[PDB]
Amino acid sequence: YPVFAQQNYANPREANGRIVCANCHLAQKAVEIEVPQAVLPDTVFEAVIELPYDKQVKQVLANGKKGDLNVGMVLILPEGFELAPPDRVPAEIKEKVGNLYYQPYSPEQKNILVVGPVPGKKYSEMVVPILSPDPAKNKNVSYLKYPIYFGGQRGRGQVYPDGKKSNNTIYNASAAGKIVAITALSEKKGGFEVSIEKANGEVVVDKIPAGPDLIVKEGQTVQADQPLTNNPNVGGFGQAETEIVLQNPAR
Ligand code: HEC
Incomplete structure (x- = not known):
């Protein structure tokens, strides 16, 4: 779970780019992410994430039975970018987001958002409302092309924080x-x-x-x-990377 990552890893992204969910969700499964190519400062934009999987195939549950899969994710934005506050998110976007509660990885990492576990049936696709920063007010950011890293997770992991294997592996x-x-x-x-x-x-x-x-x-x-x-595992974790340009308003 995202909480397993939070409680055991200070930084969710390793030097070589691997996102920590991969240390326990051992199978790879592709994901997708899309954000606008560019955004003006202090503006709310959408990040659309895809966590595809065959919804007809059930997984082994903790109780040994077969059941639906739940999903989650971690989104690493450039310093300064943050989850858009409810008051800045237009009704039309809130509707697309649905009943999701995105949370910062930690109070000191508001640029890293997580969500999950939530039902895969309903959230195999999600929308994240993001608020861009302003270089004019934040000297930790400039008008550059910035990378955005994404990790999408589906299904139960293969090993717990204590190192013990789950019942969802070989x-x-x-x-x-x-x-x-x-x-x-x-x-x-x-x-x-x-x-x-x-x-x-x-x-x-x-x-x-x-x-x-x-x-x-x-x-x-x-x-x-x-x-x-x-190998009973039917789920998987995937990563994707994209970019966005923080526009410099000219007047
Ligand atoms: C190992 C220390 C883990 C890390 C780091 C992460 N996850 Fe995990 N996750 C792990 C296990 C063993 C389980 C199964 C628990 C059980 O017995 O049911 C999970 C489960 C999830 C789920 C629920 C899946 C489902 O019920 O179908 C999700 C959505 C999930 N994990 C997401 C997730 C993400 C996004 C992580 C990285 C930020 C992450 N996990 C790390 C073990 C571990």
Whole structure:
């Protein structure tokens, strides 16, 4: 979630341009962003973002069942640019934005906006009202062509802040050996326990949460780190970059 990024990463964009959501949402899925080529100072403009995905395909949920996907994003604007205050956003734009609550990454980074999680069904496309700065009043900005960075996220991640894998990723054999048993946990918690007999006779038990499907069978020999399941992840994170020119009013 955006909060996972906020609580664990001071800056959402790394030196090489990678946005931190990618450290946990391990699958790539394209996104799109559009902003006007240019904007006058102290003016409200729209950033239209696209987070496409097949809405017919459900994902594995935290509870092990299948369900809809939720989305979120992080938008990195040039210093000085900020979310347009409600009083500056015309009715026609507020309607396009819908019931979304964009928030600054931190009180000290009002130029970085986030949103989510929100339903993918309704927000696979979003509009963000942005207010441009004024070089005449802000010396941290000038009349330049500035870059804008975007990260669009869909679906549950593969690893948590604590480093533990979620049930929405691949599970691998902890050791090489012969699978001597594949036990179904319960019927309410789901999941499995895969017993692997090593060459020395020791038996290790790999626990697999409900969600992923097994691709191995009893009696089958596996190598260390060999996948025991499929890759249930159907979501993805994508990045895009664009630009905008802050116009210099002439009179
Ligand atoms: C790892 C420390 C993470 C970072 C950094 C980010 N996300 Fe994440 N996200 C992560 C997990 C493991 C989960 C699943 C939680 C669960 O058990 O359900 C999520 C989930 C989301 C969601 C909800 C998706 C859904 O329910 O279908 C969204 C919209 C999402 N994450 C967005 C998001 C964005 C935009 C991030 C970067 C700014 C981001 N996440 C970082 C793990 C982590």
